Write a protein that binds this DNA or RNA. Structure first.
Lengths: 80, 99, 95, 335, 108, 83, 99, 88, 108, 93
DNA sequence: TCGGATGTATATATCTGACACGTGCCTGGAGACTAGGGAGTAATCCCCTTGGCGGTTAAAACGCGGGGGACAGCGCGTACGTGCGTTTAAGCGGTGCTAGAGCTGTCTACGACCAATTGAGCGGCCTCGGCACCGGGATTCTCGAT
DNA sequence: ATCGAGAATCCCGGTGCCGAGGCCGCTCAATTGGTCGTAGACAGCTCTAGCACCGCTTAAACGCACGTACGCGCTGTCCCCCGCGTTTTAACCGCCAAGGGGATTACTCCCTAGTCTCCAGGCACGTGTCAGATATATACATCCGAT
């Protein structure tokens, strides 16, 4: 923690995606990492943590997301 | 001289085997006849689905088992091991059924 | 003269089961009890939410009335987890 | 002791909020304890720092007022001084040894509660004797009873809160509920040769010679400074059936130790489990146990050996680890 | 997400959001029903169902069975402190009772 | 034609089995009759409700859902027969 | 040697005078403080209508009087006159409050 | 919150032994053991905690900061303790 | 009767048929409400009110008071074997208890 | 302001019918209002459930009659059914 | 039985504030009319409830011996009731302040409603493996004799 | 203490059967898209009632001392439940047969919702007076120690 953490993102398909994200990474950077891992464009992605949607401007650490903690990814454009 | 068990061990034997199982403990034809007798006291020439009688038996046996649990607690309170009619009456009185 | 088809939560309960326990099955009587359970809790929560809407002179049942009904009906940790799941589903749906 | 209002505030408290300098001085010279806590946890120092009474703070710190003692939500006096932006109070508290790296339950240092550059740079690194015994035999129990009736002290057979002295027959601390409750609540753990010592000398002689090192010593020191309990900020779920220490034993010991008992299994990938943002105060400063505070306690006899000891925020700990942590008064790491 | 797949999969659920919505609309509960009420209620119902089914499957494994019967639902509900309180006034058909004997009836 | 004295078909062995499932070790001899009385009351309270539902539906057959509603109406919710 | 009543007659005197009357038997300020303490454990900075506290006191005293009636019945069952904590526990267990 | 938080504690002891004795006398109890009082207090707390928690749960839903008498009446009605004389 | 006096008097009642009709219509009980449902419900409510009020007035007279207080309502309800069955889970503010001392506790 | 409805005048008219000389206090009238509202809610809820069970969309007077039979104990139910039937026949005719 | 010491009930003045009644008014209930769909009625189908035998055998009924538990009597000791003097803090009254309940007015976003369409889910087939049953060998409570 | 015989239950393996789990056709209910009217969110203002403090009075709580009545342990008797064997009853199962009445469909009418107009019933407020609360004084019933 505070140098490098490994988090999970759950998709509606039931699969878990493992991301190596900096604690200070922004949600835009996390979306870029998901794009690199899976090819999904960032515009189609919405991230859910603790029953809230994550805004692009605010960073991971200010949302109080620790290591090995699970996010949710939902497609906003052209899902299914 | 044949083998004999002390009074109380077969009772515990039965307690365990009837708490492990889940079947109905009352015979079905006598209970059906009792249900029909009460019903005729209410309305004449009634018919019953078999599921209706089975539901009534489920409910009745669950009620009696719960009441016997409370009765046993009331008997143990009076520092006894035998359940007596006054234990049933105290249980029903406290549950709000007797007043 | 066609028969009237009756609905149940059998397929949904089976999907949930195959999620939690991918190997175990369920009998017809256990599924009957599970449908009875889902119906019972549905009417409990919906009736409490209806009363909550009537107390505050609201003519709508929204998700916060369902939330308050869940808080009122379920015991502590159950209510906490059920509120968490409902909130995540609602945000997942609207996002 | 001294009577308090319905909020727990001593006369020294109310004087500190009101800033009555002659009142605080007169009370302090009269023997009033400065290290008293109200019902929420605040000391007079907390009230003085939160409002900005420098002279009151100086008089309080003069009269042996602990400066690192934690209040409500484990706030420290420095937390109050920095949060309200009182630079001179911060200077005084640092000059008197208040730690700048302490945290509250949320794991936030005083620096995180302010934004002023100058004070940020300053913050940045530049009673009756109650007796009780544990498994004593007939002669030992009767002789503690005779000591009780000659010292006019109250002896108990079952453990309770107001216990002060706990007597162990052997030299080491017994791994029984009696001694575990004694160490968690900070009671005085005394070897048997202590009690007979008084009967040999007819005097309530010293007891630091009769305190087991590195065991009850840490707990008694921790309580005498009014710091949190051992398991403060930690949640426990007891999984399975237990044989060595029963479920009631472990639950009572957890509750008496400051922890909280969970009723549902802590699924690691659940919002209720993930959103617990508390911090274990008595953990290592940089271990995983600071933020990962939830434990699933299982008995070794059941032998549910996990693939990974920790998954997410939830550890899987044997009851042996729990007992060993209680005996040593320390959060022993599972890795 | 505001998709077009189906409301259950949009919400991430297995239970039917559309059917629950209709049951709320036709059940004589209120004049109107919000768009997020069926989603919340279906999520709560699915969570409770998964709780009971997980505990019942554990009880079925303990009996070395691979198929849940009402006895296992009874055991799961009565052995859980909070599910036994949610379903305190409920009798489960063909479920039996929890085996426990008062300590004064046992031999000395 | 009528039926009578069917409460005696709830025999003493059946009552002892129901007591054993309740955890009862010894049973006084005056329990059984007492128990029968209690049972009658319970049954009369439920059937009277069930029939009242059956008459409202203008039916002449008492269905399982009438019994389920009658039990739920007096705080005895029963799972497994519909509803 | 002053006049003295036997133990039990003043108890009956109090039973009669407290069953004739209808006022509240708990002091109002302590009960209000207790209500506010529990409420603060639930939600912070709450305010209470005076009618809310009065309703809570009505309900609490009615509950305690009913529970003491059941407790007295449980004590008389055990062939005693004194009510004991186990009588309260048996009453609550049978009413479905303790389990 | 910048200001301190002040709480109440140990008010269950304001339900004194004479008050419990009066409540027992109205219940018809002639003689009372010495361990009843503490027992009684615990029982009372549980009851209160179940009602207040529901009342506050109603109060939060109306987006209110005051617990009205109707909240208490609803909370009592919710657990089979209907109270006549305060509304509804 | 086919009159136009007012629905309450047309039914021969003192309770409001129109107010009961509105309360049924706007209370989320059913989609439609029959014409005679408010009349039946008002008649039943008035009958029950008259029963309790007569018993309470008898209790007030037996205490030689000419005005009913909650104590008299409590006594009326608890002394009737069916009003006590209908209102057995109801606590009445400022009502008191029925005076009874168990025969065991009386002096010998 | 806001005006709040109550059953006070109807309860008082019934009281003057049955006991022409006695009065009633404000707290007893509050308890009477609570009683009337409670019984109204009980009977209307049972009638609603009855109509839902039979897939009817109307609460007629026979739903109210069945709810009265289900809720009120024996002689109370008998006399309440008699009163309701008499009122309905007097209103229709 | 008997007579003090005491607590409760009965009788009289008298004071107050709460109950009962009158008034303005305004909103909710009532009267009239129209349209549409809910429910009543008739006819039909077929399921499932009732009734009847016949046999087998699981369970109920009856009887008896005996042991263990219920119950009554007795003694002790301790803890609860009663009463008195002291201490606390509840209750009352009054003043003062302000948070927040409660109401009004705009006005926008959300839910109802309607028409079209199409895939989810229900009913029917059916097939194999999970669980029931059985039969033998093994282990473990139980109890009477040392 | 201890072993040893008799029952009871469990463990392991073999056989079979029927119900759970999956497939296929179809139909109807859920979804999509557009429109519209109003519910409720938000801002603002009023004024009520909840909170806080202070001082005085005195009721009620608290602490203590004493004594006795009741809880509780012990013992002894006896009777009534239990365990077990034998006999008898009738439950249960399998089968067949009728037919009543529960579902289902089609048609039709009449009952109820919806809208508009109108006005008096009941609600809020103001005010008089008398029922009930309280003080005061006796009178009688009850309790209990001592006859």
């Amino acid at each position: 923690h505070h140098h490098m953490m490994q988090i999970f993102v759950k998709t509606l398909t039931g699969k878990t995606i493992t991301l190596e994200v900096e604690p200070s990474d922004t949600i835009e950077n996390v979306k870029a990492k998901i794009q690199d891992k899976e090819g999904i464009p960032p515009d189609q992605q919405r991230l859910i943590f603790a029953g809230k949607q994550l805004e692009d401007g605010r960073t991971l650490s200010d949302y109080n997301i620790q290591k090995e903690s699970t996010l949710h990814l939902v497609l906003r454009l052209r899902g299914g | 001289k044949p083998h004999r068990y002390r009074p109380g061990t077969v009772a515990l034997r039965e307690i365990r085997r009837y708490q492990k199982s889940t079947e109905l403990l009352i015979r079905k034809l006598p209970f059906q006849r009792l249900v029909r007798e009460i019903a005729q006291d209410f309305k004449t020439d009634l018919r019953f689905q078999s599921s209706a009688v089975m539901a009534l038996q489920e409910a009745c046996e669950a009620y009696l088992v719960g009441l016997f649990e409370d009765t046993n607690l009331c008997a143990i309170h009076a520092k006894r091991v035998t359940i007596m009619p006054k234990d049933i009456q105290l249980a029903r009185r406290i549950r709000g059924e007797r007043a | 003269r066609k028969r009237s088809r009756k609905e149940s939560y059998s397929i949904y309960v089976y999907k949930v089961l195959k999620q939690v326990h991918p190997d175990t099955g369920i009998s017809s009587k256990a599924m009957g009890i599970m449908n009875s359970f889902v119906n019972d809790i549905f009417e409990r929560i919906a009736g409490e939410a209806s009363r909550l809407a009537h107390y505050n002179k609201r003519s709508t049942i929204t998700s916060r009335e369902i939330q308050t009904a869940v808080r009122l009906l379920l015991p502590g940790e159950l209510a906490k987890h059920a509120v968490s799941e409902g909130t995540k589903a609602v945000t997942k749906y609207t996002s | 002791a001294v009577k308090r209002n319905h909020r727990g505030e001593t006369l020294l408290h109310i004087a500190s909020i009101k800033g009555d300098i002659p009142s605080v001085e007169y009370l302090l010279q009269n023997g009033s304890d400065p290290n008293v806590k109200d019902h929420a946890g605040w000391t007079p120092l907390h009230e003085a720092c939160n409002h900005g009474h420098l002279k009151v703070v100086e008089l309080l710190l003069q009269h042996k007022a602990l400066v690192n003692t934690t209040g409500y939500q484990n706030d420290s006096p420095l937390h109050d001084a920095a949060k309200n932006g009182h630079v001179d109070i911060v200077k005084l508290l640092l000059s008197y040894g208040a730690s700048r790296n302490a945290v509250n339950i949320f794991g936030l240092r005083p620096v995180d509660y302010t934004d002023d550059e100058s004070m940020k740079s300053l913050l940045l690194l530049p009673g009756p004797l109650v007796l009780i015994g544990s498994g004593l035999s007939s002669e030992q129990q009767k002789m503690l009873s005779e000591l009780a009736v000659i010292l006019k002290a109250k002896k108990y057979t079952e453990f309770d809160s107001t216990v002060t002295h706990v007597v162990v027959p052997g030299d080491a601390v017994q791994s029984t509920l009696k001694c575990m409750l004694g160490i968690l609540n900070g009671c005085w753990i005394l070897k048997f040769e202590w009690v007979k010592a008084c009967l040999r000398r007819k005097v309530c002689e010293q007891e630091e010679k009769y305190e087991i090192p590195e065991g009850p010593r840490r707990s008694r020191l921790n309580r005498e400074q009014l710091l949190p309990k051992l398991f403060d900020g930690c949640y426990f779920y007891l999984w399975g059936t237990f044989k060595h220490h029963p479920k009631d034993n472990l639950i009572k010991l957890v509750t008496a130790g400051g922890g909280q008992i969970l009723s549902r299994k802590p699924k690691p990938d659940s919002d209720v489990t993930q959103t617990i943002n508390t911090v274990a105060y008595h953990a290592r400063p940089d271990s995983d146990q600071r933020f990962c505070t939830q434990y699933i306690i299982y008995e070794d006899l059941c032998n549910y050996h996990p693939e990974r000891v920790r998954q997410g925020k939830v550890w899987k700990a044997p009851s042996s680890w729990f007992i060993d942590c209680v005996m040593s008064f320390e959060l022993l790491p599972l890795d | 997400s505001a998709k077009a797949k189906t409301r259950s999969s949009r919400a991430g659920l297995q239970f039917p959001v559309g059917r629950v919505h209709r049951l709320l609309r036709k059940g004589n509960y209120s004049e109107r029903v919000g768009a997020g009420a069926p989603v919340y209620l279906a999520a709560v119902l699915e969570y409770l169902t998964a709780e009971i089914l997980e505990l019942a499957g554990n009880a079925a494994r303990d009996n070395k069975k691979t198929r849940i019967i009402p006895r296992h639902l009874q055991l799961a509900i009565r052995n859980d402190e909070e599910l036994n309180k949610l379903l305190g006034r409920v009798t489960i058909a063909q479920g039996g009772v929890l085996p426990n004997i008062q300590a004064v009836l046992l031999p000395k | 034609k009528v039926l009578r004295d069917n409460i005696q078909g709830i025999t003493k062995p059946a009552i002892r089995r129901l007591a054993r499932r309740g955890g009862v070790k010894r049973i006084s001899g005056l329990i059984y009759e007492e128990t029968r009385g209690v049972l009658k009351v319970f049954l009369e309270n439920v059937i009277r409700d069930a029939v009242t539902y059956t008459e409202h539906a203008k039916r002449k057959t008492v269905t399982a859902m009438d019994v389920v509603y009658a039990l739920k109406r007096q705080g005895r919710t029963l799972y497994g027969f519909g509803g």
